[PDB]
Ligand binder design. Structure first.
Ligand SMILES: CCCCCCCCCCCCCCCCCC(=O)OC[C@H](COP(=O)([O-])OCC(O)COP(=O)([O-])OC[C@@H](COC(=O)CCCCCCCCCCCCCCCCC)OC(=O)CCCCCCCCCCCCCCCCC)OC(=O)CCCCCCCCCCCCCCCCC
Ligand SMILES: CCCCCCCCCCCCCCCCCC(=O)OC[C@H](COP(=O)([O-])OCC(O)COP(=O)([O-])OC[C@@H](COC(=O)CCCCCCCCCCCCCCCCC)OC(=O)CCCCCCCCCCCCCCCCC)OC(=O)CCCCCCCCCCCCCCCCC
Ligand SMILES: CCCCCCCCCCCCCCCCCC(=O)OC[C@H](COP(=O)([O-])OCC(O)COP(=O)([O-])OC[C@@H](COC(=O)CCCCCCCCCCCCCCCCC)OC(=O)CCCCCCCCCCCCCCCCC)OC(=O)CCCCCCCCCCCCCCCCC
Ligand SMILES: CCCCCCCCCCCCCCCCCC(=O)OC[C@H](COP(=O)([O-])OCC(O)COP(=O)([O-])OC[C@@H](COC(=O)CCCCCCCCCCCCCCCCC)OC(=O)CCCCCCCCCCCCCCCCC)OC(=O)CCCCCCCCCCCCCCCCC
Ligand SMILES: CCCCCCCCCCCCCCCCC[C@@H](O)O[C@H](CO[C@H](O)CCCCCCCCCCCCCCC)COP(=O)(O)OCC[N+](C)(C)C
Ligand SMILES: CCCCCCCC/C=C\CCCCCCCC(=O)OC[C@H](COP(=O)(O)OCCN)OC(=O)CCCCCCC/C=C\CCCCCCCC
Ligand SMILES: CCCCCCCCCCCCCCCCCC(=O)OC[C@H](COP(=O)(O)OCCN)OC(=O)CCCCCCCCCCCCCCCCC
Ligand SMILES: CCCCCCCCCCCCCCCCCC(=O)OC[C@H](COP(=O)(O)OCCN)OC(=O)CCCCCCCCCCCCCCCCC
Lengths: 121, 53, 54, 56, 459, 99, 69, 347, 140
């Protein structure tokens, strides 16, 4: 468990207060569109299993499938983005705090670096 | 895995019984109350790895 | 065609592997469903784990 | 009648509109990679009087 | 690449929404349109690749393969509608759906810019192919053929996944551009030897290498005609494309590790040609010819010189076209007499003259007849092998002689002689079959006219 | 017999019902239009138009550019007595060898 | 054809520069993240791998039956 | 069984598992396991027959032994530390006892025989509940105590589980025993990744639960318990066979289906920790599971087996009961590979 | 187990062939005893004498395989004067496979065992040389 038990973590909180400072996903996010596509596929499979006309029947039901998937996908994307932002924040802070462990190395050009040449023949 | 409903809701379901340095009936002390208190206070807030080291 | 393609290249990789897997499958699944037998197996496993794992 | 032809041949626009939508998404992908536009050492130049960007 | 990817994913709903008698017409017409659109990818650069976005890029190696895939889809539709007349509408649409899904996976495979996304797509191509074989194949052995194909490919490719994730952990990236610019020599150690083995063995199984090839006759003989066409023309070329791409990070260890694979390739080239000489089945003959040509391509990639890569690219494109055409011709014969035996139907020149002409042209391209791109690729590989060593010419000449022998043997056996007397149902060739052969053969000669389009990035 | 199974059907000949058939479909009109669209699109459009498009693709591979650059380099170098092909790809002054 | 269908070489050149910069930055970040994870797990002094310990708010500090706790 | 009694027993099983998941005290965790087992026995015996009675007896014996060993480990840990909280265990012997007990509860090899036996004994609904929920609880305990797990013992049991699952499934021809051996193999994968990333353990658990729910509900819909029974389903409802074939392909780990995501992530995570031989062996051994999934797919969808004469009456009639969330389980178990980076949300 | 492996590895690679053979024989005997115990538990014999016979047969087969592997590997390393070479372990593994084939009285089992055990033993030698680990310690 890497980030479980990180200080200041409220248990059973899907989205903390500090996540509000991040850009929310655009409603036309390709990931949101894919969640809607999953909802549509679920609706078609429902019609097929129940032996209704696949594309025509149950338009209200198919709409509910798509809407539920888009809703949950929006909140899932927010939580995923928050966790990744948290990971990057922690990593940058640790690198800043441990300079002796993450030292800046002098850059040498390829005119100074010597590399063995392996001919292909 | 661990859903800390007790911490979230402010409940106390078994944390009273977890340790022998906690509140006991009639203030009966444990055999190693002072040692356990010292160890808990030392290891508070630094995690398992640093606490063991 | 015959000796290599139809016979020996077939025997080395896919036929031998399939035969070994079939034999091991028969060995694993050939159980009488006797709780006495596989609880004795559990006892052996527990003793081995206690002794040979440190 | 005329309606039946549209009722039957409405599926012949799907691939063309897919091509158009793909071109649009290609342009959108290009417009997010404009961080070194007019900044490469080989191609950096001065802007013309009546142009805002070198390429789109 | 989205202007080519989205129209395929729109072929899907169009196929499922068109009428019951317009599925073949719609699919064929719009496949041809998508092929025409994909022809625009041939305008490549001399310095670098076409970096469309972060996810897709095109090169002089990817572009001809994409054009071949997009061109092969409508031909497969024509052959399929030949052999799937009595099927239900839903199952016809499912077959067309499998073909479209396979094309989409192949497009994204050739244009994927990361080794891991390339792996995901190049493994995703297995499912539609397996379904097509084991569902719409004719004989009993389609099930065993599908098992062989699937498990050979997966046993080859799982260590590749392990090696790819290991390399990502080691170097930070699997992007092809980054691993090309930040490549480092591979030191001679056991760990490096096994990394090299993981990668190369995945693609050698996909190729196939001689000794890892039995799945190929099993699957190519037992698949339906569209399955046979896509298995030989395109799916064999995923191995070559992958081996060309991944050998950036495998030097100089490729100089020392290529001896077993070169020996296997040269000797198995000889052996598979000799097998072709004595095959009682036509489809098996074409499959073993495919094995021999891919052995030559493996030799080219392993010797790994600028002249060998150009020959490898040319030979891959040429073999795709030629083998697809040969499979189509054999399938027309099979749809006449309902048997794959080569000596059952004879005198087909005096029963069907224009099909005899198509057989002649396909067999003349199968053997390297100048100035065809088949010969161009074979000759470039032979020249590079001659620079590698001077006995490769001995093996290459023997292979060319045997190739001519078995190609003309197939032609003479099927077309010449006297017709079988009791086969009285050889109806005249259909316009559909004639047009299929013409659409196979004309692009090959036009590619002869303009050969720099299929010589790869090293040109 | 071990099953109630259909007999194997006789092969269906497309020329019996439709003597002037192209082999695309059982229906004559659908068959004719399938032939027409295949021939038109494939042969005419793809073959002719794609071949001429590929023939007249712009010279983005820089063959003629490289030839003109080489002519300029050769003219300049032979005018001044310099070697036509430089002996080194990079500048040895920029290169720093180990001691 | 060049006017109607294609673009100038500058667009592809500078797009490749942008793509390469993004990919190089991502590779650097991946390697640095691996290093940080290794150090955090080995030492236990960062926000990661903070396995719980017993809360010291549970200790009862009131006088007991016996003076010596 | 009365419907009210049945739903209260289901709620008691769920309450025991939730007590295990939310407790911070080893005694309360043990109480949760006990409550789960006590309410779970009648669910297995819901349809009374000798096979159900035998399966319930074997399950009770195994789970009682595991609970006894678990309590012994808890007491030994208390002896050497005086701590009741569930954290890193302070005694290696207590940790070994705890690992053995939790592995016996989960069915990891060599504690696996009861899994195929009980699953074949009990009905399809009972097997669904068994596999899913009764894997859900002990894995949460293991994730809590992961930092003290012996890697050698855990990985040995995981590789044994993968091998045994593959081989047993190869031999089996009954659908419930096939499902049980598949379950053993998947538990092997999860516990193999357990000592490195509990997040990856949770991801594999969720994907496995989704695929298992879809598969068991398809079997319940088709009323098929053997291979030959499932071979008649193409002549009644060919859609169910196709969905089952796609789900079987997903379970075998073929890209780009959802079954590839856990294997991919686990291989990557173990490679980060300098494990190569173990991921390679694990990946190669899954070909056995794929083989018997493909053998099952040949019989049901890719080939048409002979049918009978009363299938005509079955055609005339229609399926009444509607499975809850079957389309959602079908979609989630096959089409969520492009949504892989949500495992950070899972973190 | 760990003690036996430590003894075998503490004997140097190309020296003390008798001690190497003794250590490998002990390891093989322990493995055979474990296999025989599981076989007795899972497939009960018809009699105590039959159980003892089966245990002895399995134990002797495993001990012979271990002794042949260790002796052959050490002798090959000694005569070739090339320690730290996987070929020695490959030869030992194929010799052990031939011993298994002789014990089972089957040429096919002998050949397959020679191939597989040779590859396994050579891989183990390569792992010792290169630092490969099977049960890797958690990090990262
Ligand atoms: C969108 C098009 C499709 C794209 C697919 C891409 C992937 C999507 C996945 C999910 C798809 C949604 C779910 C569909 C379920 C359909 C079930 C069904 O009944 O199908 C038949 C049904 C019609 O038949 P029916 O009247 O129901 O009669 C059925 C009887 O069985 C008829 O009787 P019968 O006996 O003749 O039928 C028997 C038949 C009946 O069997 C079926 O119909 C089953 C079909 C497959 C099961 C569903 C699998 C879902 C899992 C994901 C993978 C799907 C790939 C294939 C998708 C097929 C889609 C139909 O079974 C067989 O023949 C057995 C064959 C066994 C092998 C093949 C089956 C497995 C194929 C999939 C595995 C390979 C996956 C590879 C990996 C990659 C995946 C992406 O087809 C449809 O309704 C078509 C669905 C789509 C309609 C169009 C939707 C879009 C409309 C326009 C949108 C425009 C957008 C805006 C554009 C801009 C301009 C405006
Ligand atoms: C965790 C805690 C662990 C324990 C910690 C310590 C505390 C507990 C201490 C004990 C306190 C009392 C509690 C134990 C209760 C035992 C009990 O209820 O047993 C009932 C149980 C079954 O009762 P039953 O069904 O009425 O009896 C049916 C008749 O036996 C029917 O007769 P039959 O005609 O069928 O044949 C008789 C016999 C036939 O017996 C056999 O076939 C077995 C022959 C074994 C020969 C071993 C030779 C090698 C010796 C070691 C290596 C020496 C160095 C040289 C290298 C090897 C050279 C060969 O048995 C069988 O055929 C049944 C097969 C299954 C049982 C076999 C024996 C145990 C298997 C597991 C160990 C296997 C070891 C194999 C060797 C490897 C050792 C590392 O009885 C037995 O299993 C045998 C009698 C009880 C002996 C108990 C001894 C103490 C065990 C601990
Ligand atoms: C892309 C290309 C990739 C590669 C492609 C090729 C792939 C591999 C192809 C096949 C090669 C592997 C063959 C594996 C061995 C056979 C496995 C098996 O199950 O055999 C059953 C079969 C016996 O079957 P069974 O039913 O269990 O026993 C009844 C027999 O009648 C019982 O036999 P019997 O009592 O009638 O007499 C048999 C006697 C017959 O005597 C011999 O075979 C001795 C031959 C000596 C050499 C003669 C030729 C001299 C020139 C050699 C080449 C020189 C230049 C290099 O042989 C033995 O006793 C064998 C014991 C060991 C003798 C030492 C030599 C080996 O085993 C044999 O016959 C063994 C013959 C082994 C000959 C050498 C094979 C090659 C060794 C590996 C080379 C790498
Ligand atoms: C199979 C076919 C594929 C084989 C692929 C090649 C694998 C080569 C690996 C060789 C290698 O580098 O070994 C590590 C290791 C490298 O040296 P090291 O740094 O000193 O590490 C050992 C430490 O002293 C001490 O390290 P440790 O204490 O962390 O762990 C060492 C491990 C013992 O180390 C090993 O097991 C690896 C080395 C010997 C392997 C021999 C067979 C190859 C098996 C490879 C695949 C293993 C899958 C395991 C699956 C288990 C369930 C079936 O011992 C334990 O973990 C003790 C408890 C568990 C023992 C196993 C109980 C169940 C066994 C069931 C299957 C039999 O090798 C040795 O120490 C060799 C010592 C002499 C061995 C005999 C010659
Ligand atoms: C009507 C609209 C649609 C609704 C449909 C609902 C269906 C889903 C139901 C919602 C499930 C999530 C519950 C949200 C409220 C609970 C809040 C809490 O549970 O969230 C966090 C935890 O929530 C879950 O752990 C993560 C939720 C996300 C899981 C779904 C995505 C799984 C990844 C799959 C990727 C590929 C598929 C992509 C989705 C299709 C709390 O963290 P914590 O209490 O401290 O965890 C302790 C244990 N740990 C640390 C070991 C983890
Ligand atoms: C590595 C792949 C390349 C090497 C493949 C090895 C194959 C070499 C020759 C095998 C051909 C022998 C054969 O035909 O049978 C296989 C023959 C099958 O047994 P039989 O039924 O008695 O014999 C059948 C009659 N011949 O051999 C076997 O497959 C059984 C092998 C026994 C166990 C193998 C030892 C494995 C130990 C290492 C595990 C790690
Ligand atoms: C009938 C069958 C079921 C399908 C129902 C589909 C309903 C979609 C419309 C939802 C309501 C519209 C709405 O609220 O739109 C607001 C917002 C618009 O996006 P916005 O960010 O405002 O735009 C700025 C940049 N363009 O809207 C959005 O951002 C919505 C986009 C999120 C993803 C939605 C689902 C994507 C499509 C999945 C397939 C469903 C459609 C299939 C149609 C088949 C027809 C045969
Ligand atoms: C019963 C068993 C049957 C086994 C059949 C095996 C068939 C033969 C395969 C190889 C044939 C050619 C062998 C060539 C060879 O030995 O190459 C050695 C090569 C060079 O090494 P070396 O010469 O020492 O170089 C040092 C620098 N001077 O050394 C190397 O390049 C290093 C090792 C490379 C090879 C690693 C393993 C791959 C083997 C080839 C592919 C295997 C799969 C396909 C073969 C057919 C399988 C059915």
């Amino acid at each position: 468990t890497m980030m479980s038990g990180r200080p200041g973590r409220v248990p059973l909180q899907f989205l903390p207060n500090e996540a509000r400072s991040l850009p929310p996903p655009k409603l036309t996010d390709p990931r949101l569109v894919y969640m809607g596509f999953l909802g549509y596929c679920s609706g078609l499979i429902d019609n097929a299993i129940r032996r209704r006309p696949v594309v025509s029947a149950g338009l209200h039901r198919q709409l509910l499938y798509v809407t539920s998937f888009v809703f949950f996908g929006y909140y899932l994307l927010k939580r995923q983005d928050y966790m990744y932002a948290l990971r990057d924040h922690d990593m940058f802070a640790y690198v800043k705090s441990h300079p002796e462990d993450f030292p800046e190395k002098d850059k040498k050009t390829y005119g100074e670096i010597l590399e063995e040449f392996h001919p292909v023949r | 895995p661990f859903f800390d409903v007790q911490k979230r809701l402010g409940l106390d379901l078994d944390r009273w019984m977890t340790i022998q340095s906690a509140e006991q009936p009639h203030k009966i002390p444990g055999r190693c109350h002072a040692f356990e208190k010292e160890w808990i206070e030392c290891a508070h807030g630094i995690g398992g790895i640093r606490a063991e080291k | 065609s015959s000796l290599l393609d139809l016979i020996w290249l077939e025997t080395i990789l896919p036929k031998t592997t399939s035969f070994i897997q079939m034999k091991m499958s028969i060995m694993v699944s050939n159980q009488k469903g006797l709780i006495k037998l596989y609880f004795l197996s559990f006892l052996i496993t527990i003793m081995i784990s206690m002794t040979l794992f440190n | 009648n005329v309606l039946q032809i549209v009722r039957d041949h409405w599926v012949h626009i799907l691939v063309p509109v897919g091509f158009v939508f793909g071109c649009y998404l290609d342009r959108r992908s290009d417009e997010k990679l404009t961080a070194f536009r007019n900044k490469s050492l080989l191609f950096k130049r001065e802007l013309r009087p009546n142009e805002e960007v070198t390429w789109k | 690449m989205l202007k080519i990817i989205i129209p395929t994913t729109m072929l899907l709903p169009m196929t499922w929404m068109s009428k019951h008698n317009m599925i073949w017409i719609n699919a064929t017409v719009h496949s041809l349109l998508i092929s025409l659109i994909s022809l625009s990818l041939l305008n490549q650069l001399g310095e670098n690749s076409l970096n469309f976005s972060l996810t897709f890029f095109s090169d002089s190696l990817s572009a001809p393969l994409l054009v071949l895939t997009t061109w092969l889809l409508p031909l497969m539709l024509m052959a399929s509608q030949s052999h799937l007349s009595k099927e239900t509408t839903t199952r016809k649409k499912l077959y067309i759906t499998m073909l479209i899904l396979l094309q989409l996976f192949l497009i994204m495979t050739f244009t994927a810019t990361e080794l891991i996304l390339f792996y995901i797509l190049f493994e995703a191509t297995l499912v539609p192919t397996l379904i097509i074989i084991t569902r719409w194949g004719n004989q009993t052995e389609r099930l065993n053929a599908g098992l062989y194909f699937l498990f050979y490919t997966l046993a080859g490719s799982l260590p590749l996944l392990v090696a790819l994730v290991y390399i990502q952990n080691t170097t930070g990236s699997l992007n092809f551009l980054i691993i090309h610019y930040w490549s480092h020599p591979l030191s001679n150690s056991w760990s490096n030897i096994f990394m090299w083995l993981a990668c190369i063995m995945a693609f050698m199984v996909k190729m196939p290498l001689y000794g890892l090839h039995l799945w190929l006759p099993k699957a190519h003989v037992e698949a339906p005609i569209a399955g046979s066409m896509v298995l030989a023309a395109v799916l064999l070329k995923l191995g070559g494309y992958g081996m060309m791409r991944i050998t950036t990070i495998l030097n100089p260890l490729t100089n020392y590790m290529a001896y077993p694979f070169l020996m296997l390739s040269m000797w198995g080239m000889i052996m598979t040609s000799s097998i072709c000489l004595r095959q009682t089945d036509l489809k098996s003959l074409i499959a073993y010819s495919s094995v021999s040509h891919m052995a030559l391509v493996i030799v080219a990639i392993m010797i790994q010189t600028p002249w060998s890569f150009m020959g490898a690219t040319a030979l891959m494109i040429a073999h795709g076209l030629t083998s697809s055409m040969l499979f189509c011709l054999a399938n027309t014969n099979y749809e006449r007499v309902h048997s794959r035996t080569m000596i059952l139907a004879r005198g087909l020149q005096t029963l069907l003259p224009l099909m005899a002409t198509w057989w002649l042209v396909a067999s003349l391209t199968n053997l390297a007849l100048p100035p065809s791109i088949n010969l161009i690729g074979e000759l470039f590989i032979i020249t590079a092998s001659f620079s590698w060593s001077n006995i490769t010419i001995i093996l290459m000449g023997m292979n060319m002689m045997i190739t001519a022998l078995y190609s003309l043997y197939m032609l003479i056996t099927t077309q010449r002689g006297k017709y079988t007397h009791h086969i009285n149902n050889i109806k005249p060739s259909f316009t559909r079959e004639n047009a299929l052969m013409a659409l196979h053969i004309l692009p090959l000669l036009l590619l002869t006219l303009n050969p720099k389009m299929i010589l790869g990035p090293l040109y | 017999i071990r099953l109630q199974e259909d007999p194997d059907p006789e092969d269906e000949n497309l020329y019996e019902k439709n003597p002037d058939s192209h082999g695309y479909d059982k229906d004559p009109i659908v068959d004719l239009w399938n032939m027409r669209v295949v021939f038109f699109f494939g042969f005419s459009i793809v073959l002719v138009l794609g071949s001429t498009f590929v023939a007249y693709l712009p010279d983005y591979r820089m063959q003629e550019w490289a030839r003109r650059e080489a002519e300029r380099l050769v003219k300049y170098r032979e005018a001044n007595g310099l070697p036509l092909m430089e002996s080194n790809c990079f500048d040895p002054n920029k290169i720093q060898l180990p001691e | 054809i060049a006017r109607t269908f294609y673009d100038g070489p500058e667009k592809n050149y500078e797009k490749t520069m942008a793509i390469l910069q993004i990919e190089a930055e991502k590779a650097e970040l991946r390697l640095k993240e691996l290093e940080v994870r290794r150090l955090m797990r080995a030492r236990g002094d960062g926000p990661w791998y903070q396995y719980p310990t017993i809360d010291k708010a549970l200790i009862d500090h009131s006088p007991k039956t016996t003076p010596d706790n | 069984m009365n419907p009210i009694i049945y739903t209260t027993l289901i709620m008691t099983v769920m309450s025991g598992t939730m007590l295990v998941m939310i407790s911070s005290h080893w005694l309360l965790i043990w109480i949760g396991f006990e409550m789960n087992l006590l309410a779970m026995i009648p669910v297995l015996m819901k349809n009374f027959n000798p096979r159900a009675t035998e399966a319930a007896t074997k399950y009770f014996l195994t789970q009682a032994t595991a609970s006894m060993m678990l309590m012994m480990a808890i007491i030994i840990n208390l002896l050497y530390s005086g701590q009741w909280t569930i954290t890193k265990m302070f005694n290696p012997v207590a940790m070994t006892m705890m690992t053995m007990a939790l592995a016996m509860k989960l069915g990891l090899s060599p504690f696996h025989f009861w899994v195929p036996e009980v699953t074949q004994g009990i009905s399809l609904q009972a097997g669904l509940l068994l596999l899913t929920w009764q894997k859900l609880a002990p894995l949460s305990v293991l994730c809590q105590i992961s930092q003290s797990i012996n890697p050698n013992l855990m990985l040995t049991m995981a590789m044994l589980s993968i091998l045994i699952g593959g081989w047993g499934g190869l031999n089996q021809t009954q659908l419930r025993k096939i499902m049980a051996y598949s379950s053993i193999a998947h538990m092997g994968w999860m516990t193999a990744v357990l000592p490195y990333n509990t997040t990856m353990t949770i991801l594999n658990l969720l994907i496995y639960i989704t695929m298992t729910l879809a598969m068991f509900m398809l079997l319940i819909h088709s009323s098929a318990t053997t291979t030959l029974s499932l071979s008649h389903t193409w002549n009644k409802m060919p859609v169910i066979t196709s969905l089952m074939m796609v789900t079987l392909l997903s379970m075998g780990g073929l890209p780009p289906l959802s079954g590839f995501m856990p294997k991919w992530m686990i291989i990557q995570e173990m490679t980060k920790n300098e494990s190569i031989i173990m991921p390679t062996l694990m990946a190669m051994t899954a070909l056995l599971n794929l083989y018997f999934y493909m053998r099952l797919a040949y019989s049901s969808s890719l080939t048409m087996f002979p049918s009978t004469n009363n299938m005509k009456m079955k055609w005339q009639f229609e399926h009444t009961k509607q499975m809850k969330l079957l389309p959602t389980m079908i979609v989630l178990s096959t089409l969520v590979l492009p949504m892989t980076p949500a495992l950070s949300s899972l973190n | 187990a760990k003690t036996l492996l430590h003894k075998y590895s503490d004997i140097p690679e190309g020296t003390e062939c008798h001690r190497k053979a003794y250590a490998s024989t002990s390891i093989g005997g322990a493995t055979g005893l474990i296999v025989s115990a599981y076989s007795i538990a899972l497939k009960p014999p018809a009699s105590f004498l039959e159980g003892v016979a089966r245990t002895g047969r399995y134990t002797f087969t495993s001990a012979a395989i271990g002794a042949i592997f260790g002796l052959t590997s050490c002798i090959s390393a000694q005569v070739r004067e090339k320690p730290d070479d996987p070929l020695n372990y490959f030869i030992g593994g194929c010799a052990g496979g031939l011993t298994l084939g002789a014990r089972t009285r089957s040429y096919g089992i002998g050949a397959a065992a020679c191939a597989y055990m040779g590859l396994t033993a050579a891989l183990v030698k390569m792992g010792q040389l290169e630092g490969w680990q099977v049960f890797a310690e958690p990090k990262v």
